């Protein structure tokens, strides 16, 4: 519901049919897939992990080109300092695009946060809670390094979010993954299966909308499929749904019989992916 800016408080569809059916307000979409702003909140709010997230995805048909074919590149991080790099397509060597350092602020009650106060900061103060570069487009990889106040690198295994985006190939393969590979045989417990659409090299293709079909067999039932797309009026109870922005989800529920669950995700012209969920009994 409430699909503002396509909302309507009486009867009748808004814009052409199918009309937006769910909200755009969420940091996370209906399927549980994070939107990019998710990592802004994470850089600001979570003291237990580090954050280094880059937008946009780096394909020519999804980016925006401003003055001088410059693409606005945005980085969400909690780190003290960020170095931004570019790697040409088919290359193994990156070059330094830019480098920016945050300034630490402290309130009277001790709360602390970070704002960018460099010379090319934004004239709108709140936009400096994150970092922005204007980068000319070119096929390849935009990557980032994060540093603490002692100029010590913050390694990738300690950081959440996309520390690199790259020019992908055409859709090649599905990649499925269960969030929990063992669930209770109580007829209630669920397993959430994230399916990604990637090129030959496992890179998520950012605008992929391939129709994915789910085949579930074993000790469980498909109980939902989702992609979080507001205008998508396809049945939640179908066994197939278009991916949206590269991702689609299936939800499977156990039975009251211990066993295993086999789920295969298929799409036309694409290499298929399979997962297996075991269900354990109750004493």
Partner 1 sequence: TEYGFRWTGFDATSGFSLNGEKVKLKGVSMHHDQGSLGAVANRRAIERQVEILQKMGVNSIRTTHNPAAKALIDVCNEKGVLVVEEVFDMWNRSKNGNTEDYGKWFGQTIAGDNAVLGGDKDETWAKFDLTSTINRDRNAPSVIMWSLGNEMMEGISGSVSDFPATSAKLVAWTKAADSTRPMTYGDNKIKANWNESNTMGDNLTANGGVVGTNYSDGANYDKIRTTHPSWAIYGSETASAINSRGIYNRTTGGAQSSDKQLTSYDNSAVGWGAVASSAWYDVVQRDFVAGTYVWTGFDYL
- Our CB check for Na ion shows the closer of 144 and 195 to be 144
Rule CB under 8 A: is residue 140 a binding residue for partner 1?
yes
Q: Does 92 bind Mg ion (CB under 5 A)?
A: no
Tokens representing 24 are 């755009």
> Near partner 1 by CB under 8 A, which window of 13-21, 25-33, 92-100, 199-207?
92-100
Shortest Cβ 49–Na ion spacing (Å): 6
* Residue 60 sits in the site that holds partner 1 (CB under 8 A): no
Please, are residues 186 and 178 in contact by the beta-carbon 8 Å criterion?
Answer: no
- From edge to edge, which strands make up the β-sheet containing 70-77? 131-136, 70-77, 50-55, 159-160
**Burial class of residue 101, CB neighbours in 10 A (0-12, 13-18, 19+):** middle
- Residues of 71-82 as b/e, b for ≥16 C-beta within 10 angstroms? bebebbbbbbbb
Choose among Mg ion, Na ion, partner 1, none what residue 96 binds, the Cβ cut-off being 5 to 8 Å by kind. partner 1
189 annotated to a ligand binding site? no
> Are the beta carbons of 191 and 250 closer than 8 angstroms?
no
Cβ neighbours of residue 142 closer than 8 Å, sequence gap 6 or more: 54, 58, 73, 84, 85, 86, 87, 97, 135, 164, 165, 166
Applying CB under 8 A, which of residues 14, 49, 96, 125 lies at the interface with partner 1? 96
Q: Please give the backbone phi and psi of residue 122, each rounded to the nearest 5 degrees, phi first.
A: -75, 140
The interface partner of residue 140, options being Na ion, Mg ion, partner 1, none and the CB cut-off 5 to 8 Å by kind, is partner 1
Minimum CB separation of residue 9 from Mg ion in Å reads 4
Q: Residue from 8, 136, 155, 202 that binds partner 1 (CB under 8 A)? A: 136
User: Could you tell me the smallest distance in angstroms from the CB atom of residue 83 to partner 1?
Assistant: 14
Does the annotation list 46 as a binding residue? yes
What is the Cα gyration radius of the chain?
22
Least distance between Mg ion and beta carbon 11 (Å): 8
Scan residues 2-21 and list those touching Mg ion (CB under 5 A). Answer: 9
Contact footprint for Mg ion (CB under 5 A)? 9
**Residue ranges for the binding site?**
9, 46, 49, 78
**Residue ranges for the binding site for Mg(2+)?**
9, 46, 49, 78
């Amino acid at each position: 519901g409430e699909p503002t800016p396509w909302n309507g408080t009486g009867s009748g569809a808004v814009g052409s049919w199918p009309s937006p059916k769910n909200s755009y307000f969420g940091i996370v979409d209906t399927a549980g897939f994070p939107k990019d702003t998710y990592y802004f909140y994470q850089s600001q709010w979570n003291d237990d992990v580090h954050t280094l997230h880059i937008l946009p995805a780096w394909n020519e048909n999804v980016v925006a080109k401003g003055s001088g074919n410059k693409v606005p590149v945005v980085v969400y991080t909690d780190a003290a300092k960020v170095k931004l790099y570019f790697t040409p397509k088919g290359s193994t060597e990156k070059r330094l695009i830019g480098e920016k350092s945050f300034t630490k602020k402290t309130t009277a009650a001790g709360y602390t946060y970070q704002v960018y106060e460099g010379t090319d900061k934004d004239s709108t103060a709140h936009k400096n809670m994150y970092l922005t570069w204007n980068v000319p487009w070119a096929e390849g990889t935009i990557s980032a390094e994060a540093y603490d106040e002692n100029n010590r690198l913050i390694p990738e295994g300690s950081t959440e979010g996309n520390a690199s985006v790259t020019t992908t190939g055409k859709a090649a393969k599905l990649k499925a993954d269960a969030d929990r590979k063992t669930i209770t045989a109580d007829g209630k417990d669920l397993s959430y299966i994230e399916v990604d659409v990637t090129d030959a090299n496992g890179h998520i293709v950012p605008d992929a909308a391939n129709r994915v079909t789910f085949d579930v067999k074993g000790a469980g039932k498909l109980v939902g499929v989702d992609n979080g797309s507001s205008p998508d009026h396809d049945s939640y109870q179908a066994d197939n749904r278009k991916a949206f922005s590269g991702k689609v989800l299936a939800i499977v529920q156990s039975t009251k019989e211990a066993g295993e669950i086999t789920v295969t995700a298929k799409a036309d012209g694409l290499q298929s992916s399979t997962v297996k969920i075991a269900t354990t009994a109750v004493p």
